[PDB]
Amino acid sequence: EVKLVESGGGLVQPGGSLRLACATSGFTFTDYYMSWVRQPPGKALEWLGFIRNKAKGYTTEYSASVKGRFTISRDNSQSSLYLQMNTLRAEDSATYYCARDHDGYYERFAYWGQGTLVTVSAAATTPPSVYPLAPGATNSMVTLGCLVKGYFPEPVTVTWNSGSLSTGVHTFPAVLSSDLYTLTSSVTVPSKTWPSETVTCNVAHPASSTKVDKKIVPR
Amino acid sequence: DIVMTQSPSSLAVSAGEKVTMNCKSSQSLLNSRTRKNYLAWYQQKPGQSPKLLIYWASTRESGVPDRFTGSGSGTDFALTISSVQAEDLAVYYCKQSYNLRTFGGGTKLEIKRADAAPTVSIFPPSSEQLTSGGASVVCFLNNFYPKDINVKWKIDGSERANGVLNSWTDQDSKDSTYSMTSTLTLTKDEYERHNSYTCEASHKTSTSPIVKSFNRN
Numbered sequence: 001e002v003k004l005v006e007s008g009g010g011l012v013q014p015g016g017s018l019r020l021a022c023a024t025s026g027f028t029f030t031d032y033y034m035s036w037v038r039q040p041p042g043k044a045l046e047w048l049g050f051i052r053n054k055a056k057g058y059t060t061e062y063s064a065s066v067k068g069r070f071t072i073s074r075d076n077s078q079s080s081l082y083l084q085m086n087t088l089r090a091e092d093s094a095t096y097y098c099a100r101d102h103d104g105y106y107e108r109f110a111y112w113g114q115g116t117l118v119t120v121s122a123a124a125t126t127p128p129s130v131y132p133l134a135p136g137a138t139n140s141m142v143t144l145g146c147l148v149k150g151y152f153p154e155p156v157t158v159t160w161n162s163g164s165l166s167t168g169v170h171t172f173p174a175v176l177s178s179d180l181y182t183l184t185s186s187v188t189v190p191s192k193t194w195p196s197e198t199v200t201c202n203v204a205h206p207a208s209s210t211k212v213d214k215k216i217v218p219r
Numbered sequence: 220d221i222v223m224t225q226s227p228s229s230l231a232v233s234a235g236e237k238v239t240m241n242c243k244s245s246q247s248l249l250n251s252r253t254r255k256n257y258l259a260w261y262q263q264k265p266g267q268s269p270k271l272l273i274y275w276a277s278t279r280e281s282g283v284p285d286r287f288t289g290s291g292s293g294t295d296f297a298l299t300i301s302s303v304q305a306e307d308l309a310v311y312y313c314k315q316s317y318n319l320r321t322f323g324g325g326t327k328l329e330i331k332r333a334d335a336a337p338t339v340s341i342f343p344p345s346s347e348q349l350t351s352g353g354a355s356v357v358c359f360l361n362n363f364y365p366k367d368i369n370v371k372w373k374i375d376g377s378e379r380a381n382g383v384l385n386s387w388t389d390q391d392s393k394d395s396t397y398s399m400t401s402t403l404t405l406t407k408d409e410y411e412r413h414n415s416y417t418c419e420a421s422h423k424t425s426t427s428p429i430v431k432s433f434n435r436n
């Protein structure tokens with residue numbers, strides 16, 4: 001099981017600086033180039049740089065867009081990869097991936113991390129309020145939701161019954177208004193299963209270390 | 220400077236049908252030393268990380284279905300999907316690794332399917348939000364096709380458009396539908412001055428609008 005995991009992402013002031021991390025495992029870290037790739041929400045992937053393998057001296061190269069301003073390093077005893085970002089602007093706001101790169105032969109990014117989201121804003125970390133969307137109607141199925149309102153920055157995660165409600169879920173893209181995000185998540189279950197069996201939304205906002213469970217009770 | 224450019228920007232196609240998308244390089248990606256074209260294709264499903272489909276232009280990565288074929292040489296490349304499936308909804312990226320690395324702008328593949336009508340659900344403010352001074356009325360238009368749709372909010376039989384924010388989802392990977400939220404945000408005070416709250420979904424699947432409403436009491 002090759003795994004790549006980015007961390008260090010979150011809210012940063014414009015002009016500020018930030019270091020991201022990429023933890024790797026399940027392959028000989030030292031034999032591979034590793035690259036960093038970013039992506040503004042709704043936009044395209046931009047390659048930022050790589051660091052070569054052992055055989056090639058762990059040397060770095062950068063794209064013209066961030067060259068002289070971003071810095072890649074690796075910890076070969078830990079199988080870790082870093083990106084150091086300086087003098088940030090809102091253009092730098094993006095999900096950042098680390099990807100396994102060249103091994104000396106293959107020309108592919110065979111594996112990618114899940115990405116960590118960076119938001120460059122003077123706005124402040126605001127935790128979310130979480131509201132229960134309870135109905136009542138009737139039908140053979142019933143729809144419930146949670147309203148996640150007034151948080152900053154992105155992202156939040158929403159699960160239902162701790163992930164054991166996986167189908168019938170629609171989590172909607174957040175909308176920004178007056179520097180705050182609001183999104184909702186819907187779940188559809190058999191009318192027969194609710195409210196006999198409980199339905200709970202679990203919302204997380206790691207920027208503010210917020211964790212909320214919200215049980216959906218009949219009004 | 221190797222600029223990568225992709226075509227088209229977006230297209231929809233029915234399941235079972237064939238898709239070709241193109242990738243152009245500002246110079247040849249043909250390594251003369253190795254006789255391989257350094258061009259890779261990555262598939263990025265909604266909310267997912269990119270995953271590798273093809274490398275050296277035509278080489279399928281293990282696990283990838285034969286439905287996907289990478290073709291081309293020099294400056295012009297193509298990812299063809301022989302029989303498109305509901306799960307192929309994604310943005311596709313080509314990437315050169317001949318002078319460092321550079322991604323194209325991507326092709327967004329959407330899936331055409333039969334028209335479908337939205338399931339509409341309306342939700343009054345929670346007692347929790349109310350006591351804090353706010354009142355959000357939420358309406359879910361779920362699992363409809365196609366994406367173009369209209370919501371009208373009616374308070375006490377009168378249309379209102381202030382404080383209505385709407386949000387569409389990506390296409391579903393299983394059934395190729397869209398869903399959308401319409402959220403009407405009031406103060407508790409305004410919410411209490413009126414008694415009837417109505418969400419109206421108008422969509423090409425019907426001449427008659429789907430209406431969901433609740434009374435404050």
Ligand SMILES: C=CCO[C@]1(C(=O)O)C[C@@H](O[C@]2(C(=O)O)C[C@@H](O)[C@@H](O)[C@@H]([C@H](O)CO[C@]3(C(=O)O)C[C@@H](O)[C@@H](O)[C@@H]([C@H](O)CO)O3)O2)[C@@H](O)[C@@H]([C@H](O)CO)O1
Nearest residue numbers: 052056061102103104105106107250252257316317318319
């Ligand atoms: C620098 C002397 C000449 O190097 C070559 C040549 O370019 O003619 C290629 C060189 O290839 C190898 C090797 O040493 O076996 C393997 C090859 O796959 C690469 O790893 C290269 C380099 O390490 C460069 O790779 C990169 C880079 O680091 O910038 C990244 C790659 O993904 C790709 O972009 C290459 C690009 O295609 C240029 O090569 O650049 O090293 C080797 O074949 C020697 C040969 O022994 C003669 O000296 O020739």
Ligand SMILES: [Zn+2]
Nearest residue numbers: 374409412413
């Ligand atoms: Zn009024």
